Design an enzyme around this catalytic site. Structure first.
Site, PDB file in Angstrom:
ATOM      1  N   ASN A   9      83.055  16.818  32.342  1.00  0.00           N
ATOM      2  CA  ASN A   9      83.492  18.144  31.924  1.00  0.00           C
ATOM      3  C   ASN A   9      82.314  19.095  32.049  1.00  0.00           C
ATOM      4  O   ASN A   9      81.420  19.098  31.205  1.00  0.00           O
ATOM      5  CB  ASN A   9      84.034  18.121  30.486  1.00  0.00           C
ATOM      6  N   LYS A  11      82.379  22.233  31.687  1.00  0.00           N
ATOM      7  CA  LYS A  11      82.560  23.338  30.749  1.00  0.00           C
ATOM      8  C   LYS A  11      82.303  24.672  31.450  1.00  0.00           C
ATOM      9  O   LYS A  11      82.673  24.804  32.614  1.00  0.00           O
ATOM     10  CB  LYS A  11      81.730  23.115  29.480  1.00  0.00           C
ATOM     11  N   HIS A  93      91.262  19.877  24.481  1.00  0.00           N
ATOM     12  CA  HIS A  93      89.815  19.720  24.279  1.00  0.00           C
ATOM     13  C   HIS A  93      89.384  20.412  22.979  1.00  0.00           C
ATOM     14  O   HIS A  93      89.926  21.451  22.622  1.00  0.00           O
ATOM     15  CB  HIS A  93      89.028  20.281  25.468  1.00  0.00           C
ATOM     16  N   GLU A  95      87.023  22.273  21.970  1.00  0.00           N
ATOM     17  CA  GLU A  95      86.714  23.690  22.132  1.00  0.00           C
ATOM     18  C   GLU A  95      87.971  24.569  22.212  1.00  0.00           C
ATOM     19  O   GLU A  95      87.984  25.666  21.646  1.00  0.00           O
ATOM     20  CB  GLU A  95      85.795  23.905  23.346  1.00  0.00           C
ATOM     21  N   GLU A 163      87.393  12.529  20.777  1.00  0.00           N
ATOM     22  CA  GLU A 163      86.254  13.407  20.555  1.00  0.00           C
ATOM     23  C   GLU A 163      85.835  13.372  19.093  1.00  0.00           C
ATOM     24  O   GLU A 163      86.516  13.947  18.257  1.00  0.00           O
ATOM     25  CB  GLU A 163      86.619  14.833  20.941  1.00  0.00           C
ATOM     26  N   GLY A 169      76.876  18.942  16.427  1.00  0.00           N
ATOM     27  CA  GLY A 169      75.979  19.878  15.752  1.00  0.00           C
ATOM     28  C   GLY A 169      76.091  19.899  14.239  1.00  0.00           C
ATOM     29  O   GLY A 169      75.756  20.903  13.606  1.00  0.00           O
ATOM     30  N   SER A 209      78.917  12.160  22.313  1.00  0.00           N
ATOM     31  CA  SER A 209      77.647  12.185  23.033  1.00  0.00           C
ATOM     32  C   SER A 209      77.453  10.893  23.813  1.00  0.00           C
ATOM     33  O   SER A 209      77.516   9.800  23.244  1.00  0.00           O
ATOM     34  CB  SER A 209      76.474  12.396  22.069  1.00  0.00           C
TER      35      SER A 209
END
Lengths: 246, 247
Positions: A9, A11, A93, A95, A163, A169, A209
């Site tokens: 991906n 992005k 996804h 996001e 995911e 983060g 990750s």
């Protein structure tokens, strides 16, 4: 029998120059016989990327909408994606869900339309940190998966991507064991709710990750059938992740 | 003085390579007056394709973009990518982005700032819905929308403002040329009052929403209507008549 699946991906990254260079590397790279590779370029470069990439690599749209044509400024349809030579679309996804507010209802409708139009779908699910810590990981991912399952007839055209949104983060990260337990739970869901044949033949790919250093241990997990790769997909390191079972 | 006539064609989510090839062939053949500035906004998958086929007299626009140059935004494109594909424009704040996909004024303001910093020109869209129109608050709605855009503009030579009566789209209501001119005059007055008289007199304020080859001439002649953002009619040869609305 489940063919190893490595999705890249990209992005919202790259230009024709840098992505051209990246495609040269992937064209030259030896893809294992037991591995299926898909790259998801920015929407402006689906056509460019399909033209430059070798046929051994399939191309995915990063998203799409739920009708063939319409008054939806800024959207693209499965028909357009096929018209540019892409055979996949990434849907649901993290996001799209959590930055752009895409609901389950909308995502299910996109899955049905993409599949009806002849695309293959990387369907993404996953829980946030608040959800994981409240204990509702299973609830969240099973429900997201159900909405996907309601809109899938042919599971040979689908790949599920887990995911761990809770590890983006946040100050927490997922171990290979933590990845594996969610993956086995999801595989059991497929066996329980659709078919034992579907459970055994459906790729459940890890979308957290992953690096060249970490991919072999993650890929060796029995219910992890590959990756939906973020940042490393823009680097030659992606080829190490393609080689994760070798 | 003298504001250059502006006709934008928003293809929205329509067409494939072959059908858009035919549309592009029709546009290339048509007579484009030097009075008129023509821009076409293809589906995002075909920005590159459209630019390669279109005659350089017609500019290409993206239908949307994001507010950083690169990042973790699956499904977005940046101004850098748009420029990289040979497009010089971007449509921002379109009614469908705002009301189908929930794009806020704050987000739209941030996209404007970034697009302009990156060297793109912007068709910035504003407009009120029917409940806002029927409740007597179009000025408040369109001025507040225009303020957020204005806060993020440093070069008005690269911006075109597009009034979209959302109230007169899919509601069974028609916007007359006097109603269009009423909003456009007040928007030009807003720019004068709040930015500068140079910006008020030099800036194109174009009209969106049900522009046809029959209705364009009377709309174009309105003194504060500087052109069009065309939707459905931009996929038809009738678009050429809208390009020649002043002629």
């Amino acid at each position: 029998s489940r063919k190893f699946f490595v999705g890249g991906n990209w992005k919202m990254n790259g230009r024709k120059q840098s992505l051209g260079e990246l495609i040269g590397t992937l064209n030259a790279a030896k893809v294992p016989a037991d591995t299926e590779v898909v790259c998801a370029p920015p929407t402006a470069y689906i056509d460019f990327a399909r033209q430059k990439l070798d046929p051994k690599i399939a191309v995915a749209a990063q998203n799409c909408y739920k009708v063939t044509n319409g008054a939806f400024t800024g959207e693209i349809s499965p028909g357009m994606i096929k018209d540019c030579g892409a055979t996949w679309v990434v849907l649901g996804h993290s996001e799209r869900r959590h930055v752009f507010g895409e609901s389950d209802e909308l995502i299910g409708q996109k899955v049905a339309h993409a599949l009806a139009e002849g695309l293959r779908v990387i369907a993404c699910i996953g829980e946030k940190l608040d959800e994981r810590e409240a204990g509702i990981t299973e609830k969240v991912v099973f429900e997201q998966t159900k909405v996907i399952a309601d809109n899938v007839k042919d599971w040979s055209k689908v790949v599920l991507a887990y995911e761990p949104v809770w590890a983006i983060g946040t100050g927490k990260t997922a171990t290979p064991q933590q990845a594996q337990e969610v993956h086995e739970k999801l595989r059991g869901w497929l066996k329980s709710n659709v078919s034992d044949a579907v459970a055994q033949s459906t790729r459940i790919i890890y979308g957290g990750s992953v690096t060249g250093a970490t991919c072999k241990e993650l890929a060796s997990q029995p219910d992890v059938d590959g990756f939906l790769v973020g940042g490393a997909s823009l680097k030659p390191e992606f080829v190490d992740i393609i080689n994760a079972k070798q």
